[PDB]
Amino acid sequence: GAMNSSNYAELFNNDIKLFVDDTNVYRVTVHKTFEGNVATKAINGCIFTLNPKTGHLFLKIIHTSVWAGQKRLSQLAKWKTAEEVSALVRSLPKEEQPKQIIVTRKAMLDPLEVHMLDFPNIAIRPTELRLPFSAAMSIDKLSDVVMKATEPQMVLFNIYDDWLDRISSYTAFSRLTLLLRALKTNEESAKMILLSDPTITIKSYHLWPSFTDEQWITIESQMRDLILTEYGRKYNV
Amino acid sequence: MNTVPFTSAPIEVTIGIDQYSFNVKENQPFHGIKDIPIGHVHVIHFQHADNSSMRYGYWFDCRMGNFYIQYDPKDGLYKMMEERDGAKFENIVHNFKERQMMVSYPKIDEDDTWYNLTEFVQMDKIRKIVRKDENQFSYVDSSMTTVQENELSDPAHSLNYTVINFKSREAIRPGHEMEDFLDKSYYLNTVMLQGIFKNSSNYFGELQFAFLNAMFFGNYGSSLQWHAMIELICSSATVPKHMLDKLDEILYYQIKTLPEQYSDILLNERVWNICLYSSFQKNSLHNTEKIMENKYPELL
Numbered sequence: 183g184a185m186n187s188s189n190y191a192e193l194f195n196n197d198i199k200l201f202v203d204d205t206n207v208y209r210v211t212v213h214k215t216f217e218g219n220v221a222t223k224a225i226n227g228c229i230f231t232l233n234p235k236t237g238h239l240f241l242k243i244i245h246t247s248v249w250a251g252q253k254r255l256s257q258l259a260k261w262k263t264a265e266e267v268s269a270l271v272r273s274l275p276k277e278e279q280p281k282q283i284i285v286t287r288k289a290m291l292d293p294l295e296v297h298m299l300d301f302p303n304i305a306i307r308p309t310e311l312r313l314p315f316s317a318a319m320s321i322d323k324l325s326d327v328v329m330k331a332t333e334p335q336m337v338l339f340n341i342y343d344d345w346l347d348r349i350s351s352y353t354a355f356s357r358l359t360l361l362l363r364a365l366k367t368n369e370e371s372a373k374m375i376l377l378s379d380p381t382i383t384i385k386s387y388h389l390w391p392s393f394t395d396e397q398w399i400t401i402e403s404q405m406r407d408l409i410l411t412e413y414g415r416k417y418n419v
Numbered sequence: 420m421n422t423v424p425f426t427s428a429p430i431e432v433t434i435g436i437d438q439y440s441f442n443v444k445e446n447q448p449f450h451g452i453k454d455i456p457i458g459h460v461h462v463i464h465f466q467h468a469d470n471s472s473m474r475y476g477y478w479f480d481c482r483m484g485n486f487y488i489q490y491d492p493k494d495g496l497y498k499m500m501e502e503r504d505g506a507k508f509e510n511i512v513h514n515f516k517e518r519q520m521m522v523s524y525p526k527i528d529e530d531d532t533w534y535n536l537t538e539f540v541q542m543d544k545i546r547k548i549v550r551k552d553e554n555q556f557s558y559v560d561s562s563m564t565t566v567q568e569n570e571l572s573d574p575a576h577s578l579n580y581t582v583i584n585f586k587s588r589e590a591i592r593p594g595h596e597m598e599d600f601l602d603k604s605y606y607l608n609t610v611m612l613q614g615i616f617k618n619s620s621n622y623f624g625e626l627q628f629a630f631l632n633a634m635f636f637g638n639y640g641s642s643l644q645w646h647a648m649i650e651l652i653c654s655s656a657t658v659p660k661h662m663l664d665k666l667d668e669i670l671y672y673q674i675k676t677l678p679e680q681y682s683d684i685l686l687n688e689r690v691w692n693i694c695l696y697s698s699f700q701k702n703s704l705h706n707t708e709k710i711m712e713n714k715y716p717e718l719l
């Protein structure tokens with residue numbers, strides 16, 4: 183059924199699986215019209231599809247043109263996500279298709295289930311984990327490509343950089359979710375932590391800085407401080 | 420008017436005929452039911468005094484033969500049988516009426532309830548849902564499962580209702596996934612009506628038969644089917660106007676006839692609230708909504 187703290191290590195076994203996050207698919211700015219009414223203006227979005235074992239991220243950019251002339255866009259967005267995921271699975275060789283797709287929001291279950299009827303053997307699952315993938319647009323290189331796009335486009339990224347050379351998928355995913363949780367809780371502080379030292383650079387082919395093992399420990403500790411901190415500044419503790 | 424005689428009543432049993440019922444005591448001089456209206460299907464049903472488990476019964480149409488009931492002490496139930504010796508049958512029936520050992524089908528003359536519950540139900544279709552072609556009548560009981568319930572185990576003893584599944588390739592056209600899931604009109608009008616049922620009368624006939632099996636036998640799979648067939652209509656933006664009008668009349672009499680005390684188990688909160696207050700047809704079922712709100716406002 184659902185994915186949670188009890189069956190967490192299943193993400194790192196050798197059954198191919200994908201997380202899908204649709205949070206950033208339909209994005210808007212709300213503003214006042216000359217007549218003083220309110221209106222929305224859509225901006226580009228993205229589907230966040232990640233294989234947690236390898237770090238392979240299929241970033242499908244959703245150009246605002248897809249909304250033109252459409253109604254009930256928040257509902258459409260869930261179906262559009264499912265259509266694009268389904269198209270992705272169909273484009274993969276059979277031996278690369280996932281055995282499970284895990285959706286981060288329960289509202290994607292029916293849209294994905296219906297678009298995947300052709301694949302009765304791919305399990306569509308929810309999760310009780312509160313994953314921070316919405317913060318993916320706080321990763322500068324991902325936000326950049328999304329906002330620059332002039333048409334629909336699939337960008338391919340390894341969200342773990344080269345970490346798997348040195349650590350396991352379980353640890354790499356833990357690092358990733360800690361970073362994204364921190365970016366989600368206080369983006370400024372989080373980004374300050376990551377970039378404060380100008381001698382540690384992000385490689386052109388990477389998303390995150392080239393920290394050594396020791397430096398990642400320091401960084402990881404500082405992000406935990408941050409998340410505890412904002413948890414006091416928010417709950418006055 | 421026609422008659423279903425009983426050889427005898429060796430065990431205490433509550434007998435139903437359509438929406439009527441009466442108690443027969445162990446070895447009471449009971450020889451059957453008379454004055455049964457010709458022109459309608461009927462159901463005669465049983466619940467033993469000892470083992471209220473297993474309600475069971477027989478759908479029949481008196482125009483299709485002379486039928487009687489006889490207890491089987493080996494199998495332990497009241498069995499329906501057909502008498503082929505037409506002469507023998509009228510002789511038997513006449514003797515039991517002269518001795519007045521029969522109960523009279525107790526139809527009030529103002530009362531169209533049974534007609535309204537069975538308007539579209541036809542023996543021929545019942546026999547296709549309940550497969551046992553050597554008998555002109557059909558046995559149903561509480562425990563019989565449906566073909567869809569078996570996909571989810573004795574195929575000879577099943578209710579072969581039409582399978583409806585909203586997340587199925589039959590229900591969903593490629594390229595219309597969102598359209599067809601949110602608005603079921605394609606599935607209702609093209610796949611089911613035109614494709615399978617052929618007309619709305621056969622559709623309504625299965626719907627009413629499903630309801631009746633749920634109410635008389637507490638048959639869970641029949642209840643599931645009745646709600647599915649309502650939900651398919653209620654969730655279709657485009658339904659012929661006469662069908663909606665008739666559906667409102669069908670459902671009205673079903674809700675009217677339901678035992679007040681069985682509503683908690685026979686009525687699906689989600690389907691009804693969806694159909695009456697959210698679906699495309701939320702404003703189309705005026706009679707049904709009024710009787711539901713006055714009789715089962717807790718459910719809503």
Ligand SMILES: Nc1ccc(Sc2ccccn2)nc1
Nearest residue numbers: 237238239240338339340387
């Ligand atoms: N920079 C980079 C680009 C592509 C790849 S390969 C790949 C294939 C499919 C999905 C994700 N990554 N690995 C690293």
